[PDB]
Amino acid sequence: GSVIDPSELTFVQEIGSGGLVHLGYWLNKDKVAIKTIRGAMSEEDFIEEAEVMMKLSHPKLVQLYGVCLEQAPICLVFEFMEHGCLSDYLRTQRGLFAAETLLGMCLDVCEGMAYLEEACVIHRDLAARNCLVGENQVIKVSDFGPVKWASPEVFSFSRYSSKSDVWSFGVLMWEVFSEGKIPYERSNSEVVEDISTGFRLYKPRLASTHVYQIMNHCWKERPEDRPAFSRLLRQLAEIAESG
Numbered sequence: 359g360s361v362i363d364p365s366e367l368t369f370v371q372e373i374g375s376g377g378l379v380h381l382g383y384w385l386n387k388d389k390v391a392i393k394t395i396r397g398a399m400s401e402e403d404f405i406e407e408a409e410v411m412m413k414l415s416h417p418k419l420v421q422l423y424g425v426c427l428e429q430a431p432i433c434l435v436f437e438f439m440e441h442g443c444l445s446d447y448l449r450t451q452r453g454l455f456a457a458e459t460l461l462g463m464c465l466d467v468c469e470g471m472a473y474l475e476e477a478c479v480i481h482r483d484l485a486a487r488n489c490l491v492g493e494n495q496v497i498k499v500s501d502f503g504p505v506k507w508a509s510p511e512v513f514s515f516s517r518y519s520s521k522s523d524v525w526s527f528g529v530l531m532w533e534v535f536s537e538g539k540i541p542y543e544r545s546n547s548e549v550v551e552d553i554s555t556g557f558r559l560y561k562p563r564l565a566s567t568h569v570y571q572i573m574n575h576c577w578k579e580r581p582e583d584r585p586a587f588s589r590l591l592r593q594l595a596e597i598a599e600s601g
């Protein structure tokens with residue numbers, strides 16, 4: 359449920375585009391991020407994803423205040439994340455990040471994805487662009503309600519599972535350690551044929567041998583050979599404890 363009246367919301371500034379993302383206030387008190395509809399995408403599916411997001415509670419997942427239904431275009435009322443999009447945050451603060459900080463960001467994404475794995479929810483589009491940065495560099499997973507991030511089962515047979523999101527997490531891990539670099543920067547059919555041949559993303563300078571090894575385990579051809587998010591969480595924690 360959670361229905362918000364349009365008069366309660368106050369639009370301040372446009373902060374994102376795709377629909378549009380606006381910085382605003384709810385009841386003239388709380389800082390909120392308002393996601394308005396474009397056109398493309400169904401109005402019911404946009405609300406169906408919001409109902410799923412409001413039922414999943416984890417400190418590493420973005421929380422929703424409510425939904426505006428009365429006036430069209432309809433909108434989602436999200437909590438405001440101070441530093442915004444992860445991919446953009448990595449590019450702006452490039453060269454200022456330490457290896458420990460970048461690994462800490464990957465552990466935050468893996469925490470939220472381990473919760474979704476147990477709750478049997480497939481993300482379908484896990485990327486650095488769909489991750490948000492809050493206060494004290496805390497990373498939260500969004501849009502949990504593009505073949506570069508897709509696994510061989512997805513771009514050829516459209517088989518979605520928890521192991522296909524593991525492949526996406528491997529590509530996400532590459533974006534973090536490369537400090538916001540575009541993966542396979544190359545057309546869709548060019549990369550889809552490159553992956554099957556045996557070509558993967560190169561080793562980033564900031565990432566270590568143990569970090570890149572975990573990325574390749576996520577990049578395994580067979581879904582069964584890839585480790586689960588629950589296992590990956592403990593493997594990433596072992597690197598942070600030692601080096």
Ligand SMILES: CCC(O)(CC)c1ccc2cc(-c3[nH]nc4cc(-c5ccccc5)sc34)[nH]c2c1
Nearest residue numbers: 373379391436437438439440441442443500501
């Ligand atoms: C310096 C970062 C800043 O420029 C500050 C205004 C910025 C830019 C963009 C965003 C977006 C957010 C944000 N907070 N919470 C959400 C949820 C979002 C969302 C978008 C699409 C689908 C689902 C959720 S975007 C967002 N905070 C920002 C902060």
